[PDB]
Design a protein around this ligand. Structure first.
Ligand SMILES: *C(=N)N1CC[C@H](NS(=O)(=O)Cc2ccc(Cl)cc2Br)C1
Length: 200
């Protein structure tokens, strides 16, 4: 059986509030579903049917029937431009995320963000067929043609109206190395349970 990503512990659905810019940095983390005062635990995945070096990304996605990129940003260690990028392996294939925050996007900046996020996803091959638009399906970086840009602007416009800023999901995607060592072999992604803003 082929290599696949496994969720071992989900994020907890309720009880963690989305943070604002003004709270600054944080050493704390979105809790795992099984977390307790006395034994804190965190979202945790495992790469399976493969041992060796790997890349794991976390993206923030929506809780709609057609799952898309969310406008909020993952922040914390190993977070850039709303994506958390870590390594796995070469022996231990289990990866945890103990420093995840979900940063409120500026409403008014939802569109600009999405467009900003959709582009990067398409450039990097981070699930654009699935998460941006069906016809952007040519995943895998990438120099953007004019027709790609227009689907993106159109998608972003459309999906900005749809955006629910009170709920997100994590999407985990693992990458294995090609012959050159570049992490190119993308395994099918896995979506987490919904996370709802506490607002407290
Ligand atoms: C940033 N300057 N903020 C001011 C209000 C928020 N503060 S907080 O630390 O995020 C928690 C808080 C505190 C008081 C009130 Cl009334 C609401 C909230 Br969410 C962000």
């Amino acid at each position: 059986d082929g290599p696949y990503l496994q969720i071992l512990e989900q994020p907890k659905q309720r009880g963690f509030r989305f943070r604002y810019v003004c709270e600054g940095p944080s050493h704390g983390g979105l809790p795992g579903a099984s977390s307790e005062k006395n034994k804190k635990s965190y979202p945790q995945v495992k790469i399976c049917n493969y041992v060796g070096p790997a890349k794991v990304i976390v993206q923030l996605v929506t809780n709609g029937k057609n799952i898309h990129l969310h406008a909020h940003s993952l922040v914390g260690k190993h977070c850039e431009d709303g994506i958390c990028t870590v390594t796995a392996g070469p022996k231990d294939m289990v990866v945890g995320f103990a420093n995840l925050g979900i940063l409120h996007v500026t409403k008014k900046k939802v569109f600009e963000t999405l467009e900003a996020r959709m582009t990067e996803a398409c450039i990097r091959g981070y699930n654009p067929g699935l998460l941006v638009h069906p016809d952007l399906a040519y995943l895998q970086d990438r120099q953007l043609g004019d027709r790609e840009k227009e689907l993106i602007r159109q998608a972003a416009l459309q999906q900005t109206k749809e955006m629910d800023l009170s709920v997100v999901r994590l999407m985990f995607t693992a990458f294995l190395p090609d012959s050159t060592g570049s992490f190119t072999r993308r395994l099918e992604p896995v979506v987490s349970d919904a996370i709802y803003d506490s607002k407290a």
